[PDB]
Design an enzyme around this catalytic site. Structure first.
Site, PDB file in Angstrom:
ATOM      1  N   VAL A   8       0.806  -1.219  -0.264  1.00 19.28           N
ATOM      2  CA  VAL A   8      -0.003  -0.208  -0.025  1.00 19.28           C
ATOM      3  C   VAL A   8       1.018   1.367   0.028  1.00 19.28           C
ATOM      4  O   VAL A   8       0.716   2.236  -0.699  1.00 19.28           O
ATOM      5  CB  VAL A   8      -0.890   0.233   1.530  1.00 19.28           C
ATOM      6  CG1 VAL A   8      -1.713   1.275   1.116  1.00 19.28           C
ATOM      7  CG2 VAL A   8      -1.784  -1.088   1.227  1.00 19.28           C
ATOM      8  N   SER A  41      27.004  16.662  29.939  1.00 23.56           N
ATOM      9  CA  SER A  41      27.491  15.195  29.992  1.00 23.56           C
ATOM     10  C   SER A  41      26.861  14.808  31.266  1.00 23.56           C
ATOM     11  O   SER A  41      26.099  15.386  31.876  1.00 23.56           O
ATOM     12  CB  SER A  41      28.940  15.160  30.028  1.00 23.56           C
ATOM     13  OG  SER A  41      29.693  15.532  29.098  1.00 23.56           O
ATOM     14  N   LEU A  42      27.331  13.276  31.545  1.00 21.80           N
ATOM     15  CA  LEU A  42      26.707  12.678  32.856  1.00 21.80           C
ATOM     16  C   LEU A  42      27.766  12.375  33.658  1.00 21.80           C
ATOM     17  O   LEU A  42      28.640  11.561  33.194  1.00 21.80           O
ATOM     18  CB  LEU A  42      25.950  11.444  32.065  1.00 21.80           C
ATOM     19  CG  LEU A  42      24.456  11.580  31.668  1.00 21.80           C
ATOM     20  CD1 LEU A  42      24.123  10.382  30.828  1.00 21.80           C
ATOM     21  CD2 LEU A  42      23.442  11.929  32.794  1.00 21.80           C
ATOM     22  N   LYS A  70      20.638   4.029  29.132  1.00 25.10           N
ATOM     23  CA  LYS A  70      21.576   5.029  28.311  1.00 25.10           C
ATOM     24  C   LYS A  70      21.802   4.195  27.066  1.00 25.10           C
ATOM     25  O   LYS A  70      22.484   3.266  27.186  1.00 25.10           O
ATOM     26  CB  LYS A  70      22.673   5.033  29.231  1.00 25.10           C
ATOM     27  CG  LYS A  70      23.785   6.119  28.654  1.00 25.10           C
ATOM     28  CD  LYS A  70      24.805   6.247  29.907  1.00 25.10           C
ATOM     29  CE  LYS A  70      25.867   7.304  29.472  1.00 25.10           C
ATOM     30  NZ  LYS A  70      26.821   6.663  28.390  1.00 25.10           N
TER      31      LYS A  70
HETATM   32  N1  LIG Z   1      22.419   8.072  26.100  1.00 26.54           N
HETATM   33  C1  LIG Z   1      21.225   8.261  26.889  1.00 26.54           C
HETATM   34  O1  LIG Z   1      20.646   7.279  26.919  1.00 26.54           O
HETATM   35  C2  LIG Z   1      21.128   9.467  27.746  1.00 26.54           C
HETATM   36  C3  LIG Z   1      19.630   9.622  28.279  1.00 26.54           C
HETATM   37  N2  LIG Z   1      18.607   8.774  28.064  1.00 26.54           N
HETATM   38  N3  LIG Z   1      19.682  10.722  28.838  1.00 26.54           N
HETATM   39  C4  LIG Z   1      20.351  11.886  29.123  1.00 26.54           C
HETATM   40  O2  LIG Z   1      20.168  12.842  29.778  1.00 26.54           O
HETATM   41  C5  LIG Z   1      21.255  13.971  29.777  1.00 26.54           C
HETATM   42  C6  LIG Z   1      21.015  14.999  29.041  1.00 26.54           C
HETATM   43  C7  LIG Z   1      21.654  16.239  29.526  1.00 26.54           C
HETATM   44  C8  LIG Z   1      21.478  16.033  30.789  1.00 26.54           C
HETATM   45  C9  LIG Z   1      21.456  14.892  31.060  1.00 26.54           C
HETATM   46  N4  LIG Z   1      21.741  11.625  28.557  1.00 26.54           N
HETATM   47  C10 LIG Z   1      21.854  10.487  27.847  1.00 26.54           C
HETATM   48  O3  LIG Z   1      23.268  10.270  27.280  1.00 26.54           O
HETATM   49  C11 LIG Z   1      24.200  11.396  27.416  1.00 26.54           C
HETATM   50  C12 LIG Z   1      23.836  12.396  26.230  1.00 26.54           C
HETATM   51  C13 LIG Z   1      25.572  13.069  25.803  1.00 26.54           C
HETATM   52  C14 LIG Z   1      26.137  12.296  26.943  1.00 26.54           C
HETATM   53  C15 LIG Z   1      25.638  10.910  27.388  1.00 26.54           C
HETATM   54  O4  LIG Z   1      25.832  10.027  26.425  1.00 26.54           O
END
Ligand SMILES: NC(=O)c1c(N)nc(OC2CCCC2)nc1O[C@@H]1CCC[C@@H]1O
Ligand SMILES: NC(=O)c1ccc[n+]([C@@H]2O[C@H](COP(=O)(O)O)[C@@H](O)[C@H]2O)c1
EC number: 6.5.1.2
Length: 313
Positions: free
Chosen positions: A37, A84-85, A116
């Site tokens: 489709v 970053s985290l 993540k």
């Molecule tokens: N990779 C992930 O699944 C993920 C996520 N689900 N949520 C966040 O929240 C961050 C956003 C800025 C403060 C916290 N970060 C993630 O990964 C970060 C993005 C850049 C560095 C890490 O990979």
């Protein structure tokens, strides 16, 4: 046959209709109609576009294939930085984190837990519902403008539900199986393979020829809104629903955890579930749910104080 007057109107109907199916099939991972489709109508639209190329629009599904070739990527600043985290590795690391949050907040705090995703962080800016910029995180304050390449990522909407102006961030990744496939294709071509799916994702998005990128099999999960616009989410969990609402792919595995102990459940639950997923993850992201509270805690220079990543070994 078809006149320009007739084709101009018919095209809109096809983009509308085709984009609707593509949304279901790419963003909800649950198509409504049979592939043929879709293909029938898609071929009707291509025929209309080939006869009158002037009706070709950026939100048309025929552009998912790319074609543009860049010299290089333009700098893409982030007025709102892409943080970053902070990292945790033990139960101690996680529980100490919780201890810190209750100390500064002065009460029990609810956590939104997300997986993540192991890929490339991206930021997406929309105006009046049109996609206008896609960017890598870069060094947090300046990334690269990879808008053309992201036009070919099928789950990324060229135009939204509502003509709303917003910027949203998340991950762009390659599912395990496309990873395997691509590596075999690369073996056959006598090139170096990608060591892992995030490396494949990252090399793909750095390819200047958008036509190669289109072929790569990339996908998104959106998890943060950077610039809310008229958006109304007040907690992270709420934000994840509202991201679906306006039409992005969100990961279904997120939970809302009213205690740190439930948080440790969740980490275990998906620590054993890890291999059953089509995509790779390198841990769990724990976020303070209440936006009001994320605000109160605020940001270090690197990463937010209201969030932490439990990384698997
Ligand atoms: N990779 C992930 O699944 C993920 C996520 N689900 N949520 C966040 O929240 C961050 C956003 C800025 C403060 C916290 N970060 C993630 O990964 C970060 C993005 C850049 C560095 C890490 O990979
Ligand atoms: N709703 C659907 O069934 C649906 C939507 C988009 C793509 N597809 C399929 O994906 C493949 C590639 O299509 P596109 O490159 O236009 O996205 C085709 O085989 C098509 O049949 C199916």
């Amino acid at each position: 046959p078809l006149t320009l007057t007739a084709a101009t109107t018919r095209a809109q109907e096809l983009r509308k209709q085709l984009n609707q199916y593509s949304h279901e099939y790419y963003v909800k991972d649950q198509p409504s109609v049979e592939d043929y489709v879709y293909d029938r109508l898609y071929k009707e639209l291509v025929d209309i576009e080939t006869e009158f190329p002037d009706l070709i629009t950026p939100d048309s599904p025929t552009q998912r294939v790319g074609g543009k070739v860049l010299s290089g990527f333009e700098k893409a600043p982030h007025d709102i930085p892409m943080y970053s985290l902070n990292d945790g590795f033990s139960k101690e690391d996680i529980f100490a984190f919780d201890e810190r949050v209750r100390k500064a907040i002065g009460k029990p705090v609810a956590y939104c837990c997300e997986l993540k995703i192991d890929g490339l962080a991206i930021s997406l800016r929309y105006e009046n519902g049109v996609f206008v910029r896609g960017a890598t995180r870069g060094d947090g304050t300046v990334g690269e403008n990879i808008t053309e390449n992201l036009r070919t990522v099928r789950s990324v909407p060229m135009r939204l539900t509502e003509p709303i102006s917003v910027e949203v961030r998340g991950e762009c990744y390659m599912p395990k199986q496309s990873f395997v496939a691509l590596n075999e294709e690369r073996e056959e071509n006598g090139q170096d393979i990608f060591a892992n799916p995030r490396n494949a994702a990252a090399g793909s998005l750095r390819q200047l020829d958008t036509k190669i990128v289109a072929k790569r099999n990339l996908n998104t999960f959106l998890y943060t809104v950077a610039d809310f616009g008229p958006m109304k989410a007040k907690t992270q969990f709420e934000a994840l629903e509202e991201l679906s609402a306006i039409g992005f792919r969100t990961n279904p595995e997120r939970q809302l955890c009213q205690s740190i102990d439930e948080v440790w459940a969740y980490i275990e639950e998906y620590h054993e579930k890890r291999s059953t997923l089509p995509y790779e993850i390198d841990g769990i992201v724990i976020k303070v749910n209440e936006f009001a509270l994320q605000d109160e805690l605020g940001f270090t220079v690197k990463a937010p104080r209201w969030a932490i990543a439990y990384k698997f070994p």
